[PDB]
Amino acid sequence: SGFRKMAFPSGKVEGCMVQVTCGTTTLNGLWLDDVVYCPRHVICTSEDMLNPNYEDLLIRKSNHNFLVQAGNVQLRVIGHSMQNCVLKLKVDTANPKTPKYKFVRIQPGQTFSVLACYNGSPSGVYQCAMRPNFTIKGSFLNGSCGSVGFNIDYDCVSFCYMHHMELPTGVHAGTDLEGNFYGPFVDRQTAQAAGTDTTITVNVLAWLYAAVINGDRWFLNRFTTTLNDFNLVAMKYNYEPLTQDHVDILGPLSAQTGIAVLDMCASLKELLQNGMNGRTILGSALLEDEFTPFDVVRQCS
Amino acid sequence: SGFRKMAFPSGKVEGCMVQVTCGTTTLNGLWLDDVVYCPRHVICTSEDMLNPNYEDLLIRKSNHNFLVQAGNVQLRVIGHSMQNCVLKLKVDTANPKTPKYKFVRIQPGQTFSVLACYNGSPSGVYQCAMRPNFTIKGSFLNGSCGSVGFNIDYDCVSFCYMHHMELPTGVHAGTDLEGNFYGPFVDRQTAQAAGTDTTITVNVLAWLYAAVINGDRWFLNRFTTTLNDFNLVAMKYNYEPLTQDHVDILGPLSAQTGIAVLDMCASLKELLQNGMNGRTILGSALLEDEFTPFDVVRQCSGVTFQ
Ligand SMILES: Oc1cncc(Cl)c1
Ligand SMILES: Oc1cncc(Cl)c1
Ligand code: NA
Numbered sequence: 001s002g003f004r005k006m007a008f009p010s011g012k013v014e015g016c017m018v019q020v021t022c023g024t025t026t027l028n029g030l031w032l033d034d035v036v037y038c039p040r041h042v043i044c045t046s047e048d049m050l051n052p053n054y055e056d057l058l059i060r061k062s063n064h065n066f067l068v069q070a071g072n073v074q075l076r077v078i079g080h081s082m083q084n085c086v087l088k089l090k091v092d093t094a095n096p097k098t099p100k101y102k103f104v105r106i107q108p109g110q111t112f113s114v115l116a117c118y119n120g121s122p123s124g125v126y127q128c129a130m131r132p133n134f135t136i137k138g139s140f141l142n143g144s145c146g147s148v149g150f151n152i153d154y155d156c157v158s159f160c161y162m163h164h165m166e167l168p169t170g171v172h173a174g175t176d177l178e179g180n181f182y183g184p185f186v187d188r189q190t191a192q193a194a195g196t197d198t199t200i201t202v203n204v205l206a207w208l209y210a211a212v213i214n215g216d217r218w219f220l221n222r223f224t225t226t227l228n229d230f231n232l233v234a235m236k237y238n239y240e241p242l243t244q245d246h247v248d249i250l251g252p253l254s255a256q257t258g259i260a261v262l263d264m265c266a267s268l269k270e271l272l273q274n275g276m277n278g279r280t281i282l283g284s285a286l287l288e289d290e291f292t293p294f295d296v297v298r299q300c301s
Numbered sequence: 302s303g304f305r306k307m308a309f310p311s312g313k314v315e316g317c318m319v320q321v322t323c324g325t326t327t328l329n330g331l332w333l334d335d336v337v338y339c340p341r342h343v344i345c346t347s348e349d350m351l352n353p354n355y356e357d358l359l360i361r362k363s364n365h366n367f368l369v370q371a372g373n374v375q376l377r378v379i380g381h382s383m384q385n386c387v388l389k390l391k392v393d394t395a396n397p398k399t400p401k402y403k404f405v406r407i408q409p410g411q412t413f414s415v416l417a418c419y420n421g422s423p424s425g426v427y428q429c430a431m432r433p434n435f436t437i438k439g440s441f442l443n444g445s446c447g448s449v450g451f452n453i454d455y456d457c458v459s460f461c462y463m464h465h466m467e468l469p470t471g472v473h474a475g476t477d478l479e480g481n482f483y484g485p486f487v488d489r490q491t492a493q494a495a496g497t498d499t500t501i502t503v504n505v506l507a508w509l510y511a512a513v514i515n516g517d518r519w520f521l522n523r524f525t526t527t528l529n530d531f532n533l534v535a536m537k538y539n540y541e542p543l544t545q546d547h548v549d550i551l552g553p554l555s556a557q558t559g560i561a562v563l564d565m566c567a568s569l570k571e572l573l574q575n576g577m578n579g580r581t582i583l584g585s586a587l588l589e590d591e592f593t594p595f596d597v598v599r600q601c602s603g604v605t606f607q
Contacts, residue, residue, distance in 0.1 A: 001441070001442075002438055003440055004425075004427040004439065006440060007425065009312075010426065011423075015312070116307070121606065121607035122606070122607070123604065123605045125309075126305040138303050139302075139304055140302070214471070283438065285587045286584075
């Protein structure tokens with residue numbers, strides 16, 4: 001029993017965290033095989049963050065301008081190239097702790113674990129979701145750029161995020177491990193602001209199914225709803241539209257509890273209208289949207 | 302910026318988790334040097350669990366009755382002994398991934414990370430607090446017994462918890478690594494219940510300081526109070542008493558934000574009396590009490606442990 005925002009064990013990722021230094025800038029890199037991946041703004045000075053010309057800054061660098069430190073061993077760089085917004089530093093030594101891994105670009109509403117790091121040394125691990133506005137609500141201080149997000153499935157680590165910057169509202173933006181930003185953001189110190197955030201509707205429904213599974217039914221009701229009527233109500237609370245894809249993804253949790261998806265949608269509608277009335281659901285006094293249908297099946301019965 | 306329930310990196314502990322089987326019962330063990338630590342109830346059947354005599358049950362078991370699996374390698378048991386409620390299995394091979402470590406016993410209100418495991422295979426990590434009633438609100442399914450709680454300081458893993466059992470309210474109970482239970486619990490299938498819990502006052506205040514550090518300032522007011530006056534409020538709302546020791550501990554946050562502790566207790570006092578009035582604090586409608594003062598400082602400073 002119980003229900004916790006659970007992260008994946010971080011050990012396979014700890015083994016790949018290194019420190020990358022260019023000039024006065026130091027941040028984190030991801031050492032897989034003989035390549036070290038880090039944000040390309042490691043090569044920007046103070047003067048460059050407004051309108052950096054990355055091709056022009058990088059052509060002026062040679063391999064020995066990059067200091068890569070793994071533990072207290074120094075790694076020697078033997079090549080460097082840029083892919084979108086990530087720098088790829090070829091090093092002379094393959095990481096002996098390299099896990100089985102792949103790179104995956106995730107969709108809004110997907111969750112992952114974050115290993116927050118500073119100076120190539122891991123600080124802590126926590127669970128996050130990619131918000132509908134393509135930001136994440138993380139916990140990052142100066143020096144954490146290059147921290148990475150991941151899932152683990154059967155000892156294979158799927159890397160899906162690397163941290164690049166904090167937006168003015170205190171939320172965080174980054175790229176996949178191919179250097180493509182999530183959302184409309186750029187590695188530039190320009191005025192950019194996240195779109196209005198919305199609640200991940202399909203995750204809330206899954207978290208409600210999770211509450212039924214741990215034995216709580218107080219919020220159910222005898223009503224049902226059409227898909228479109230539910231979406232007309234839910235968008236008035238800044239909830240994401242719920243699609244037929246979302247309905248199918250919830251099929252298994254529906255069957256395990258015996259509550260049709262559109263019936264649980266009716267329950268959510270009433271919860272949005274009533275509030276919780278001093279009760280809690282899985283220990284929370286708000287509707288929780290950072291567990292996915294997959295996460296719920298993982299942690300529950 | 303940002304504030305998240307944050308666990309320590311679990312790598313040093315992942316390398317110590319092994320599966321331990323004795324009969325049908327199979328659970329998780331902690332492998333350090335040449336000893337495997339696990340709950341002593343691994344030797345009991347469901348019949349035995351109702352009124353076990355552990356030394357009698359243990360005098361009958363022999364080394365070969367303990368199947369220890371470190372991943373895919375079998376470890377061979379060459380000895381067995383019992384310290385309080387944990388069983389110590391001497392094994393033939395020292396663990397090459399043994400980190401620097403200590404066994405420590407924590408206090409109610411202190412936090413720790415839990416590496417949840419199943420068949421000696423780690424599956425998740427999360428952050429927990431020892432509640433004043435000596436339970437933890439974890440997330441465990443069957444097969445989790447033997448999972449361990451820890452803190453990391455510098456290079457050293459401080460082991461503080463190992464999971465033994467779930468209570469009927471859905472919360473969890475365990476021992477330290479020397480086998481002493483947290484709270485008035487016994488390792489037998491009997492009628493056991495968590496006592497009434499209370500809220501960890503010093504932790505709520507720490508979390509209010511984290512909110513101020515992160516720009517949530519709406520609950521601050523012009524008022525102040527005294528330790529005596531506040532503690533009367535705390536007892537009324539089922540909060541732990543606030544001691545002068547607690548105030549001293551909150552010092553580095555009171556200075557760093559400019560809000561004195563009794564100044565912040567004035568805010569907490571109003572929050573307990575008047576409610577939240579529709580607003581949130583750090584994205585929560587509840588007053589969070591599972592961040593210690595050290596947790597707040599360390600997350601809002603940047604301390605790393607390689
Ligand atoms: O470089 C930074 C990355 N993340 C957060 C901050 Cl406040 C700074
Ligand atoms: O054997 C168990 C231990 N802890 C929790 C559960 Cl639900 C079962
Ligand atoms: Na005040």
